[PDB]
Amino acid sequence: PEPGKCDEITTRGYSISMSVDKARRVIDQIRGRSYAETLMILELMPYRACYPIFKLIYSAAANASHNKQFNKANLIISKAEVNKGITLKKVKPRARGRSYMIKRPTCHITIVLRDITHFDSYDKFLESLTPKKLIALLGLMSTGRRRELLCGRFRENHKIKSFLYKIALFKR
């Protein structure tokens, strides 16, 4: 089916009391970084947000380990985003009878961990092949095996996707 099924562990923190912007200022850094580096960084950062984000990330690591059985060394943070939560409004008094609105923003944070080494068999083997060699190799195997081979991250990384559908190498 899809690479989203094999590599990925998703984790949602809900209702963290960081305001979305602040939390973004941390999350933008750790996007695309090895789980180890991201740990040490989030240990020493100045900001407040880094602490909940840390608890989160550590958790998602335990999940990739225990549930889908991944090696912690091979974890990178593939996709991480913050979205607005439920805002709680409160009214406060001001000078001369005017009021004002305070909002105490929350957010959801979604961290998506992705193993690199999963698929690596197909990966490095398909790297091994020149563009003609690979087509000649797929000239044998059934539609089943073709689909099973190329179902790695391969087509995307090297930007072959629309090419192979044009070579009549596939069905949609």
Binding site: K68, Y122, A136, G144, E148, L149
Partner: protein, 170 residues
């Protein structure tokens, strides 16, 4: 069966291996072998040679616009009244006939020259939105227009040869 097998093996056993989907049976055909070139011809075809036409073109008048026609090609024109699909028509207003060997220039028309074309279709154009608008006078009018159109195919250009040619001769 190799799809059900490799999917159940990528299902039951996490972290799939290359040996299972591609067995070691297959070495691939050698890069210089006929059995390599039939595949690589299948999937990466060489561009086929262009179909033959006469080398000729004519400038013809339809519905008082002037087209350059080359045979084998279809063009769009004004609806031709009382023309039916699969109809053989002859366009008799012909201003200019080029051949890479010569060119015939009418005064005004090339005499006896005729263009045989067949009417392959009767259409309506892409809808053009005619929109009338005056600011602050609170008046807008949205009106579509679809022009009727005739799609014709030029087959052949004929009966020029007797007319005097000219040429650039250095």
């Amino acid at each position: 069966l190799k799809a059900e097998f490799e999917e159940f093996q990528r299902p039951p056993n996490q972290k799939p291996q290359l040996s299972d989907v591609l067995p070691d049976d297959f070495q691939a055909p050698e890069p210089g072998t006929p059995e390599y070139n039939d595949i690589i011809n299948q999937f990466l075809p060489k561009k086929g040679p262009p179909p033959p036409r006469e080398e000729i073109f004519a400038v013809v008048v339809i519905g008082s616009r002037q087209y350059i026609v080359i045979p084998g090609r279809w063009i769009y024109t004004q609806r031709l009244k009382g023309a039916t699909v699969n109809d053989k028509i002859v366009l008799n207003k012909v201003l200019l006939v080029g051949t890479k060997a010569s060119t015939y220039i009418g005064t005004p028309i090339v005499t006896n020259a005729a263009v045989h074309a067949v009417v392959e279709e009767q259409l309506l154009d892409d809808k053009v939105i005619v929109f009338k608008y005056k600011k602050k006078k609170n008046y807008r009018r949205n009106i579509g227009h679809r022009q009727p159109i005739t799609r014709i195919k030029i087959t052949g250009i004929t009966g020029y040869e007797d007319y005097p040619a000219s040429t650039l001769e250095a």
